[PDB]
Symmetry: C2
Subunit: 747 residues, 2 copies
């Protein structure tokens, strides 16, 4: 032989030969992506599904057998949330979350993470990951901040670009490449209240200004699929948003990839957004809008068939979507090799030493040292003879008390979209306890022979009660507090590991207050009051408001969810076996009502502060300490006048005036002095990592293409306007940390 | 003539004759509305100003003298912020803030307020007030929530319509009518962070949906002027926003009134929004956009002139603005009679008994009882001596001696009680000592005057709110004060009732003064905790600009009264309410959040959210739009829609039955919400469309008719059109916007 089965026949002819043989239910079936947890049998055989997601290892094997019993034997696309590692394969390598990864400011490293993930994913027979996430974290109340690369469009684009390259490899014939997904297109991350898929009050120009740029980048770089957002934007759900899908994605960007909806997008237009009277009309709307894959709306099957039968849409529209789906399957070679799981390759590559080394590198470089009174590195810093550290000169016996609810919690350390986080039902125990080094594990393994490591839980966070169940913050626990206070009073250092956990994170779980829940604030107050130096380690999904006692503690480390090696990286940082390198990809609010606290705030406000609160963030985008001092000086623009096709070139001089080496992340912001429409005060446009030995000075070149110095004007065009600009260069987005030099652009 | 001085000549010909006589500097100056506090001499003589604002009584007189010395003697328009009463005339009747007035749900009363204001304003020689405020209070962080009529577009339109009607009177020849102003057109109230004039991230459709309806109403009803907002909206400041000004205001609505910017709108485009390189280009851009009056951008004078000289804009563009301004002045009769202040008129009408009586009625009907465990009315409620509707209350049966301890920073603060835009609030510089003390009854005053002869009223401050420190200065919350709390605790332990009067004050309110936390600042939380723990029943009275987060102790107190800023008679109303001398009638025009991060907390939330709560916090507001108690129980029953067919020109008619099942009379406010069941684009869960006040004697039942025109059952569709879409609707009727309080009945609009 049949021509669609002949690999010598051109793809377009194979597609036409198969399409002409399909019944309409078989064609509608190809548009369906169904939840395999509900039973692969009916999905493959009765609904003729084109794709499955959340397919357990036993159901992947069953799905291939079922395909063999179908009339046309069209291979399935098996898709999965493989979000920061192969989230739902027991024993896979689980990396930090994207938010954690973004603190490395290292696209080359993030590409290694994505490539390592795809290698593991491919060995399990999954073809397609719903990753990377390109949402921009502009309201910290949102439950899914942990899934973003932070608050900056340029850095998001850098790191999402790296993920797509790493996942897709050499292309559709690469055996270790998988399809990437640009999600969640677009505007999902900034909706009313920071709630999950509440209304997006985002105009066309606002979306173009702060949300689209990373999506346009990965579209142009060949991201195989896009996922359409759950949310209504200016009253129109993305699933039927013609401006966004046709004018922007297909038209302005010329995108030729394949679309998939988010979970039950089509159905939600009936029962949650209340914009369609029934499933037939919602199905017709989704077809008319140009959707391809419809994720987990089972009733699209009968709804689209009735819509065609009633003349609401043409069978030709179904054909157009199936043509695109079949083209993808043919180009992946799935009719010749359906890419079944391979046990021998799973044993060779899943959680390989290779992959664990990448994971350790990301964990080590993601930790952000936010405050330090000199207590760190502890006892002046330690040396090794990998392996246990030696007691340093002048500190033969020390005791480190490791306390707090997140100090020994391996599930919470890995975060959402991993293990037992809840979206997959075949990982009851999550990932093997084996594979995660908690903070307590890390200190127990690295503290010198001669030092002691003690543990006390100190505080609980929450319990669940009936109304899904609702969170009940843990009560005061004087006995639990007093046990941790006793450990600290008998210690030289108290390492308090605090944060959030899964019931306070993710879909349907935005938070209003951003505060530590349960007994954690009381624990931190009591610990600091002992006079033993306290290091607060925040293991949490997103930036939290920390209590006054955390700001009075000796040091504060931000770890996001640092993955399987995170606990080793934490102990190494505290003990000085590594230098800190992480830099914040996101700003920390002092109060939920303080927002916006992202750095790229649009100008115009009457005043600089709330009457009851500063507008200065607790910690700002790009901030983060090392164990040395670095002086920035002598920022110069080399030729200040520019035409549109030129490059802004600059130099700055850095000096390591301290005693330890550093990898410094130089950050380059552009400010547009006079804008035709109101605009951000500044935006990150470039950055550079610079290694500096103690006492070393270096003059490093910097550049920003003039073409990147854009704004979105009143006509919705992203343009460089002639006029004055400032280049702002320094170690963070804090204005008092930035050198500045003027430049101009002329027509 | 000369023809422009000839009253027999038609207005259009008078305008043309005068325009032809004017130099270009005098035409540009006629567009200027300058701050009289900086000197009326230069403003009138050197800059040929067409208008002044913030003009002190002495400067009003001097301004008329200076006008007679100018070449053409063009009379000035004198304008003022007369925001709730004649704000900055010492001894005027100061009413509750607009937000307090809105709790009455009484447009007829609000019209009386505005007409009484206008009478007093006209006597002082001011022609034009920058009122009413039509902003919608959708972010409680915003500092200017006190100036709004709350969070609901329909109720805002109702009350703003009333204000414009009362202000303007019989029209441009009415000696007691003044020009009203629809401010701040539009979207100013919902900007990033709830900050003052930060960026408004508002699409055309969102603006049409929730912000424009009150403005469209008063535009069609003849509001003489509109004021352009300070904010940049989708990147474009309102001052140069062609879609809003040309397509909507002048185009869709056909509005023919006069425009004025807000304060230094044009200059801010240079120094604060950074969208114009210099003042000549900002001036040109303001002129091109069709601006009329330019408020407090003095450099517009030289800016516009240089813009004309460089051909950036045509002198004909200046001519067009001057024609509209001069036409207004001619139709006001200002060339015949410039409406000078009149001292005899001032003595006769300002703070008259009739105006004081309107004020007391608004104060009484505006208070909102939010919680009551039975403690109120105190001691079972009191009566006055028969035939004495004004004297002390009589001690009741079984309670010969009771002591009421009045405590808290706002218990005896007559300035904070009047609120922003009044007295010494700060925008005027000629009344450093505020309005006369005798005109304001504080909460302490009210209890002292009304408590029975054998009862006692004690006072203790209990808590301070703030002090100011050098960097304007910054707010420093008042530190813990154990001794002050102990004094108030001792007073409460030695009393039968503690009335704790808490809230905010001027440094936490208004322009440049949004708040992040919405909490009570200073020692107030500590005071409330300590008071409730005494065992003496505590009534919390909130005198504040806007809804605040109240601590758990306030929710454990015996009763909570919301007073907003209740004006000069507010303290009498509070005492009368607590003692049962009046029944509570107020109903919230705005919802109260439990935390700033809980917002949106307005009732008309757009559908679509995955989930119902935050993981750490309910989404239920502390108190919801429309809530408010009386001193009796009212059962709602048997909601019925009348008829089956409802077409585009029909009225949906319905009936509901109310029964007063308790022991005291009530004026109940029945609220009528419409819910559009299936919508072409996502929409609010429900919207208020009607209400009705019903008086019920004890035990009385009434079947009450309700109606909503089908043409009011609109949404704004994907094409930016406000339309009624055929399909199913739900009518929801009850005593508040709480879903568990609403009866509901379906209806269908045909088509
Ligand atoms: Ca510029
Ligand atoms: Ca409808």
């Amino acid at each position: 032989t049949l021509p669609y089965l002949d690999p010598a026949v051109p793809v377009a002819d194979r597609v036409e030969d198969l399409l002409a043989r399909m019944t309409l239910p078989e064609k509608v079936g190809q548009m369906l992506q169904l939840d395999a947890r509900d039973g692969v049998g009916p999905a493959v055989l009765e609904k003729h599904a084109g794709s499955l997601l959340h397919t357990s290892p036993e159901n992947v094997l069953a799905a291939h057998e079922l395909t063999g019993r179908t009339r046309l034997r069209i291979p399935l696309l098996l898709a999965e949330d493989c979000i920061h590692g192969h989230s739902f394969w027991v024993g896979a390598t689980i990396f930090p979350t994207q938010l954690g990864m973004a603190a490395t400011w290292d696209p080359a490293l993030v590409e290694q993470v994505a490539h390592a993930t795809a290698v593991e994913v491919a060995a399990t027979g999954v073809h397609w990951t719903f990753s990377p996430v390109l949402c921009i974290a502009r309201d910290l109340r949102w439950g899914r901040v942990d899934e973003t690369f932070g608050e900056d469009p340029f850095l998001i684009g850098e790191l999402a670009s790296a993920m797509v390259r790493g996942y897709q490899g050499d292309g559709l014939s690469d055996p270790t490449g998988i399809l990437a997904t640009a999600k969640h297109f677009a505007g999902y991350s900034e909706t009313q209240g920071g709630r999950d898929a509440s209304e997006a009050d985002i105009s066309q120009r606002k979306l173009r200004s702060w949300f689209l740029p990373p999506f346009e980048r990965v579209a142009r770089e060949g991201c195989a699929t896009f996922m359409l957002g759950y949310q209504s934007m200016d009253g129109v759900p993305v699933t039927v948003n013609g401006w966004l899908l046709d004018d922007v994605l297909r038209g302005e960007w010329g995108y030729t990839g394949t679309l998939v909806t988010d979970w039950d997008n089509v159905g939600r237009m009936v029962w949650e957004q209340h914009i369609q009277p029934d499933y037939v009309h919602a199905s017709a709307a989704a077809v008319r809008a140009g959707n391809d894959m419809v994720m987990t709306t089972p009733r699209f099957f009968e709804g689209a068939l009735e819509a065609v039968d009633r003349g609401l849409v043409e069978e030709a529209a179904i054909d157009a979507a199936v043509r695109r789906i079949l083209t993808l399957k043919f180009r992946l070679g799935l009719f010749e090799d359906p890419r079944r799981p391979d046990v021998a390759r799973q044993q060779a590559v899943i959680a390989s030493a290779e992959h664990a080394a990448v994971n350790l590198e990301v964990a080590r470089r993601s930790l952000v040292l936010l405050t330090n009174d000199g207590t760190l590195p502890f006892a002046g810093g330690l040396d090794r003879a990998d392996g246990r550290a030696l007691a340093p000169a002048g500190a033969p016996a020390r005791t480190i008390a490791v306390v707090g609810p997140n100090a020994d919690d391996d599930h919470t350390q890995l975060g959402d979209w991993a293990g037992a986080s809840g979206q997959a039902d075949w990982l009851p125990d999550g990932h093997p306890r084996e594979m995660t080094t908690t903070v307590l594990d890390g200190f127990r393994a690295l503290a010198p022979e001669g030092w002691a490591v003690t543990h006390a839980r100190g505080a609980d966070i929450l319990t669940l009660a009936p109304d899904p169940q609702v969170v009940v913050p843990a009560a005061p626990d004087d006995a639990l507090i007093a046990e941790a206070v006793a450990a600290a009073r008998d210690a030289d250092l108290a390492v308090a590991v605090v944060g959030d956990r899964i019931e306070l994170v993710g879909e349907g779980r935005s938070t209003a207050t951003l505060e530590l829940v349960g007994g954690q604030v009381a624990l931190l107050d009591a610990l600091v009051a002992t006079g033993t130096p306290v290091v607060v380690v925040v293991v949490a999904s997103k930036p939290l408001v920390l209590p006054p006692s955390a700001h009075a503690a000796a040091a504060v480390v931000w770890a996001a969810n640092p993955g399987m090696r995170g606990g080793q990286a934490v102990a190494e940082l505290v003990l000085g076996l590594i230098e800190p390198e992480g830099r914040l990809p996101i700003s920390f609010a002092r109060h939920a009502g303080q927002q916006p606290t992202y750095y790229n705030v649009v100008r115009g406000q009457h005043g600089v502060r709330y009457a009851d609160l500063t507008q200065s963030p607790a910690f700002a985008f790009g901030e983060g300490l090392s164990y040395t001092t670095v002086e920035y000086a002598d920022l110069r623009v080399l030729g200040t006048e520019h035409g549109p096709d030129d490059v802004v070139r600059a130099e700055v001089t850095l000096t390591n005036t301290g005693s330890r080496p550093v990898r410094e992340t130089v950050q380059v912001y552009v400010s547009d002095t006079v804008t035709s429409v109101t605009w951000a005060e500044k935006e990150l446009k470039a950055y550079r990592k610079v290694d500096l030995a103690p006492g070393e000075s270096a003059t490093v070149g910097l550049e920003v293409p003039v073409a990147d110095c854009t704004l979105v004007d009143a006509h919705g065009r992203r343009v460089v306007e002639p006029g004055e600009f400032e280049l702002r260069v320094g170690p963070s987005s804090r204005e008092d940390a930035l050198l500045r030099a003027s430049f101009t652009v002329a027509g």
